[PDB]
RNA sequence: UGAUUU
């Protein structure tokens, strides 16, 4: 078992180093817990290790490089076969480790690697974004640690003495910010079936209530709105879960959460979202509050369909429009733009669904009527 | 807590 393959770390070492607050000073060591398995995930791993290394000053002693040196020797001592490796790392890799690991994976197709990260290190710096993309392109699967992964790491690698994992405050909030940020910098694209199913604007017939939201940012420069290529991406609502958001978190709120995290300066910005459902009353109230607090940020909301929340949704849309948000129903040009920009389309052009224009006209008339009452 | 990279 893993407990006999590693010396489990002190619980305080784990809790302090794997806390997932995205902005965290004082944590000058990187920790890496790993499992080496066969192609078959069943059974215990072949081996498991804990590595650590100081962030500064020598990247050669970061735990990713210690892992590489260990793994080379270990493979010499065991009969060769394909390996699936999993890492739980407290900080995501620096540019040097990202490139070294990418080189290693690109030269060795017998090894595949999954990296779960507690926090993103310098996620806002383009050299780090680029190096994480290089690592992804070499085949590494990179994900943010969520509750299940912290619990698994606790059970396997920590001297918990039979006590269960206890989540810290704001674990889910931190997770959602980091997962959106990682999707941004890896340039994740939406599945085309997912897009077409969720943005079709005919009367909704599925029992599912889910909201997908694409977003982008423009900056005002010499009276012209210019693109800001950094903060562009998509997200969806978080369904309720007692270990996540117990009452869920709607897509509009996750979107709003991202804007302060971007640390926009004092210039004028226009933030646009393309959401498959118009916001419910709660979401519209929160967006109105945001507008009240961020004068330099102009909000533009394009919706595929109008969501009747069985409540005060019309009042929410009216309040948003009155407070200066642009609210409009998506037309052909917005659907095509989202297909071209946010969707994993693999060179294929946008193919409109039947009735797109007719549905857009009827929805736009309904939105006009709501805004005029 | 925007967080010393040779
Ligand atoms: Zn490193
Ligand atoms: Zn809502």
């Amino acid at each position: 078992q893993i407990r006999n393959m590693v010396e489990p770390m002190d619980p305080r070492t784990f809790v302090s180093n794997f806390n997932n607050r995205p902005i965290l000073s004082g944590l000058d060591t990187v920790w890496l817990c790993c499992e080496v398995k066969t192609k078959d995930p069943s059974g215990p791993p072949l081996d498991a290790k804990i590595f650590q290394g100081k962030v500064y000053p020598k990247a050669k002693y970061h735990p990713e490089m210690r892992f590489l040196r260990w793994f080379h020797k270990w493979r010499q001592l065991h009969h060769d076969q394909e390996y699936k490796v999993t890492w739980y790392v407290s900080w995501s890799p620096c540019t040097r480790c990202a490139n070294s690991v990418a080189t290693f994976l690109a030269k060795d197709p017998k090894v595949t690697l999954t990296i779960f990260v507690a926090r993103l290190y310098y996620f806002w710096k383009p050299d780090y974004q680029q190096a994480l993309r290089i690592l992804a392109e070499a085949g590494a699967t990179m994900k943010i640690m969520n509750y299940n992964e912290f619990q698994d790491c606790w059970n396997k690698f920590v001297d918990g003495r039979g006590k269960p994992f206890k989540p810290w405050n704001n674990l889910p909030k931190h997770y959602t910010l980091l997962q959106a940020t990682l999707g941004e910098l890896l340039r994740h694209l939406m599945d085309p079936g997912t897009f077409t199913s969720n943005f079709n604007n005919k009367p909704w017939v599925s029992g599912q209530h889910e909201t997908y939201l694409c977003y982008k940012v423009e900056r005002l420069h010499n009276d012209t709105w210019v693109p800001l290529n950094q903060h562009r991406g998509f997200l969806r609502n978080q369904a309720p879960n007692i270990h996540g958001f117990p009452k869920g978190r709607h897509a509009a709120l996750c979107f709003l959460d991202l804007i302060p995290f971007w640390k926009l300066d004092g210039q004028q910005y226009r933030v646009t979202c393309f959401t498959s459902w118009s916001p419910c009353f709660s979401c519209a109230q929160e967006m109105a509050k945001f507008i009240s607090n961020n004068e330099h940020v102009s909000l533009c909301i394009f919706a595929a369909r109008i969501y009747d929340d069985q409540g005060r949704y019309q009042e929410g849309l009216r309040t948003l429009h009155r407070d200066g948000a642009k609210i409009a129903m998506m037309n052909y040009s917005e659907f095509e733009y989202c297909w071209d920009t946010f969707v994993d389309r693999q060179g294929r052009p946008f193919q409109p669904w039947d009735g797109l224009d007719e549905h857009s006209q009827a929805l736009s008339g309904r939105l006009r009527a709501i805004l005029q009452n």
Side-chain angles (χ1 to χ4, degrees):
Chain A
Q1 297 302 312
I2 293 183
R3 300 177 292 265
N4 300 23
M5 304 172 175
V6 306
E7 203 152 337
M9 69 175 77
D10 186 293
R12 180 56 185 161
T13 303
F14 174 82
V15 166
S16 65
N17 280 106
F18 281 82
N19 187 280
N20 70 343
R21 193 184 204 276
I23 302 299
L24 205 45
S25 310
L27 292 179
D28 64 359
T29 303
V30 186
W31 284 83
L32 188 164
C33 302
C34 64
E35 293 188 59
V36 178
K37 299 186 139 181
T38 66
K39 293 230 75 57
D40 190 328
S42 184
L46 299 172
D47 210 342
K49 283 255 180 295
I50 300 174
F51 297 101
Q52 54 161 308
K54 301 285 305 303
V55 171
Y56 294 102
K58 313 179 193 181
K60 78 174 81 153
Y61 294 117
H62 287 184
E64 304 93 312
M65 305 300 296
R66 298 185 193 258
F67 171 87
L68 287 183
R69 294 191 289 270
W70 168 79
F71 193 44
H72 182 85
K73 173 55 172 290
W74 183 89
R75 291 171 80 183
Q76 292 181 331
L77 298 173
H78 295 81
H79 291 284
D80 181 57
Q81 61 177 311
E82 299 194 23
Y83 297 121
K84 299 184 132 50
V85 179
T86 301
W87 290 358
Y88 303 119
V89 302
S90 58
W91 284 116
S92 66
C94 75
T95 62
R96 295 177 166 85
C97 288
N99 271 280
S100 296
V101 176
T103 297
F104 166 80
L105 294 175
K107 280 144 53 190
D108 195 349
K110 289 164 177 161
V111 177
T112 59
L113 177 63
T114 297
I115 306 173
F116 291 100
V117 322
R119 295 178 309 276
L120 293 173
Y121 193 56
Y122 280 120
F123 59 83
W124 64 92
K125 290 213 176 300
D127 290 351
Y128 287 77
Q129 300 164 349
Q130 180 181 242
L132 294 183
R133 283 188 296 269
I134 288 171
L135 182 55
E137 276 155 18
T141 301
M142 280 183 69
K143 303 176 176 311
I144 302 303
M145 295 181 72
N146 201 350
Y147 178 94
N148 284 349
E149 288 76 38
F150 293 112
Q151 181 179 244
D152 192 55
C153 196
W154 173 270
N155 289 340
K156 290 168 166 169
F157 293 103
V158 176
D159 186 13
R161 298 138 206 159
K163 306 204 62 165
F165 172 65
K166 189 199 166 59
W168 43 84
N169 162 267
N170 286 331
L171 194 159
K173 175 179 92 142
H174 299 154
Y175 169 83
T176 65
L177 283 182
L178 293 164
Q179 192 40 262
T181 302
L182 184 63
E184 265 185 53
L185 64 86
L186 298 180
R187 299 169 178 168
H188 284 162
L189 297 171
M190 193 184 296
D191 177 82
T194 295
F195 175 82
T196 296
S197 293
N198 283 278
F199 281 82
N200 191 320
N201 61 350
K202 71 198 210 313
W204 190 256
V205 289
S206 172
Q208 285 288 321
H209 185 66
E210 313 171 288
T211 305
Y212 286 77
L213 184 156
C214 309
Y215 59 88
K216 67 165 191 183
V217 186
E218 302 160 285
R219 184 181 54 86
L220 189 59
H221 175 80
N222 290 342
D223 226 13
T224 303
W225 285 112
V226 307
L228 186 76
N229 298 310
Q230 262 292 332
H231 309 298
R232 210 168 66 178
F234 73 98
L235 58 85
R236 56 152 307 171
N237 69 296
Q238 305 295 125
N241 184 293
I242 71 169
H243 296 311
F245 302 96
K247 295 196 180 292
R249 194 157 183 80
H250 294 189
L253 300 198
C254 297
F255 165 65
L256 289 183
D257 298 339
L258 292 180
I259 301 168
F261 201 54
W262 294 338
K263 288 298 190 177
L264 300 175
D265 59 12
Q267 300 182 73
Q268 298 295 323
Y269 291 93
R270 178 165 73 185
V271 182
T272 299
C273 65
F274 307 88
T275 183
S276 57
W277 291 106
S278 59
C280 77
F281 178 73
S282 300
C283 286
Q285 272 194 131
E286 279 296 314
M287 295 171 110
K289 182 204 282 250
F290 177 89
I291 288 178
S292 90
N293 281 121
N294 298 275
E295 254 234 329
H296 63 300
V297 176
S298 305
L299 226 53
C300 299
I301 301 152
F302 288 97
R305 300 175 300 279
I306 296 169
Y307 181 59
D308 185 341
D309 64 0
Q310 304 268 247
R312 299 165 64 193
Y313 76 102
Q314 294 188 0
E315 176 189 343
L317 299 180
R318 282 194 289 273
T319 288
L320 265 174
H321 180 247
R322 161 186 65 86
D323 292 358
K326 172 154 288 206
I327 313 168
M329 303 310 298
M330 291 174 73
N331 293 318
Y332 190 99
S333 49
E334 288 79 38
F335 292 116
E336 172 160 40
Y337 176 83
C338 288
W339 175 269
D340 291 343
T341 302
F342 299 106
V343 172
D344 191 12
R345 70 197 179 90
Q346 266 159 338
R348 298 200 183 276
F350 175 60
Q351 287 146 73
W353 45 85
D354 298 329
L356 188 157
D357 296 308
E358 171 162 25
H359 296 317
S360 286
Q361 293 197 340
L363 290 168
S364 291
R366 176 174 174 190
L367 179 58
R368 194 179 324 112
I370 291 170
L371 293 186
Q372 290 172 349
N373 285 123

